[PDB]
Amino acid sequence: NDVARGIVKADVAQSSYGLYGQGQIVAVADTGLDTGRNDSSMHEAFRGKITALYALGRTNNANDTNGHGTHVAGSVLGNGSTNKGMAPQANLVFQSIMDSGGGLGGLPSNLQTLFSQAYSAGARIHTNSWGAAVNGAYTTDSRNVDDYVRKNDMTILFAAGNEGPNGGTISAPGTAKNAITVGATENLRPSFGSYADNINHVAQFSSRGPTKDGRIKPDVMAPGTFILSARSSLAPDSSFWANHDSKYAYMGGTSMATPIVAGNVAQLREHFVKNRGITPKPSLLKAALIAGAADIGLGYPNGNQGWGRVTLDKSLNVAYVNESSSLSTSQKATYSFTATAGKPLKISLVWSDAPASTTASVTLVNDLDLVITAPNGTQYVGNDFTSPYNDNWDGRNNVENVFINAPQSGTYTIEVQAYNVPVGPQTFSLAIVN
Ligand SMILES: [Ca+2]
Ligand SMILES: [Ca+2]
Ligand SMILES: [Ca+2]
User: Fold this and answer.
1) Is 194 annotated in some ligand binding site?
2) Cβ neighbours of residue 47 under 8 Å, at least 6 residues apart?
3) What is the DSSP string of 38-73?
4) Based on the domain organization, do 360 and 239 belong to the same domain?
5) Is 163 a known ligand-binding residue?
6) Do 262 and 360 belong together in one domain?
7) Which annotated residues bind Ca(2+) 1 (predicted)?
């Protein structure tokens, strides 16, 4: 965590903007949490900050004999003396889903029940380092995530899976359109070797897109190797990649990258609520993370890195649209933005789409298109990264981006076009970085 904090610029958010996640509640569904008791026996990283601790997989036992859930929660918000999480003043809702067999049998058949329970406790961010290796398929769980996000303002994150490096290996429910799906780059701890030596390396095991219907997943990346975080007092050494001390130890996986981003989302949500005066929709938090992310060097579009590695300080200051307009087929929304040469111009359009059928060959339901016109008349369409930039239109993704590395100074015209909206109207969010 301490190194990952610097990589994703959570340090700048903390020290310069004062964003520690205070007043935000993050829910974690994972194996268990240290002793499983909300009392003075609990690990220092979480003692005193647990809103609710629910035992789903084993009756009245939310402890963590595995160590995965304690480590994950630690990276979101641990507030122990060392190795803090990204949002150490956020409060925790923990749903213990591990069963007596070490399986994830505490998950309900309808995931909306899981999310509802956490929502009723106050959580508005829900992070999940679990999934099924279904090679990019959109399953009933994916459908249920998408319906839940469209109806409730809960931001839900899923790990991409650990079945890389082959393409097409994204886990479900990480294949959901309306979730933020997170893959893993490397942490910078090079004395541990090649898995932790270049922050612009995708971790070899991180699952890679596209999804079965051709969408870009994961959405964003964060460090996921040799992450030092909270060690459950009941977990054995074999659960960790390396020891550190009795209270903290190392783990790696897309399970580790996901909670780092969840904590960053709590910092970003805090910023919008306290400093920008709005409650941001899930689509806007997603668009802000994507517009601010860094190309790790592979270029776009790319199923290995998605839209790049989270860079939180860029995401804080975006110009935005927060689901303030909704469109039906053939309508358009038009905005103007004055850009400065000298810094890249990145514009991201994101919408929480209608859930698809699991029998559909194409999961996108409502198709919006992003069209940007530059001061000298050049036009750019969403996700077209080959010149000319206005001949390849996107009909698959519910994220569309226009990234211009060397913009003209002057006013750009931003149009959001409703190409086909059968389940309308459809709202959207926009985030602009310059
Ligand atoms: Ca490496
Ligand atoms: Ca489109
Ligand atoms: Ca093109």
Assistant:
1) yes
2) 40
3) SSTTS-TTTTT-EEEEEE-SSTT----SSSHHHHHH
4) no
5) no
6) no
7) 186, 194, 197, 201
Q: What CATH number does the domain containing 343 carry?
A: 2.60.120.380
Contacts of 137 (CB under 8 A, 6+ apart): 172, 175, 211, 212
Query: Is there a single domain that holds both residue 273 and residue 413?
Result: no
For residues 222 and 270, membership in a common domain is answered with yes
Query: Is the same domain home to 149 and 14?
Result: yes
Please say whether the beta carbons of 327 and 425 come within 8 A: yes
Give the distance (Å) from ligand 1 centre to CA of residue 226. Answer: 12
Question: For residue 18, what are the domain limits?
Answer: 1-317
Positions marked catalytic: 30, 68, 255
Are 189 and 323 in the same domain?
A: no
Give the number of whichever ligand sits closest to the CA of residue 382. Answer: 2
Ligand nearest to the CA of 389: 3
367 carries a ligand binding annotation:
yes
Q: How many A from CA of 156 to the centre of ligand 2?
A: 23
State the distance from the centre of ligand 3 to the C-alpha of 162, rounded, in angstroms: 32
C-alpha 290/C-alpha 219 separation (Å) is 7
| Closest-approaching ligand to the CA atom of 192 | 1
| Number of structural domains the chain divides into | 2
Closest CA to 79 of 221, 246, 223, 247: 247
Six-digit token string for 107: 């998950």
* Same domain as 225, residue 129: yes
Measured in angstroms, the resolution is: 1.5
63's tokens: 């402890």
Determine whether 332 is exposed, middle or buried from the number of CB atoms within 10 Å of its CB (0-12, 13-18, 19+): middle
Q: 339 C-alpha to center of ligand 3: Å? A: 23
- Cβ(356)–Cβ(364) under 8 Å? yes
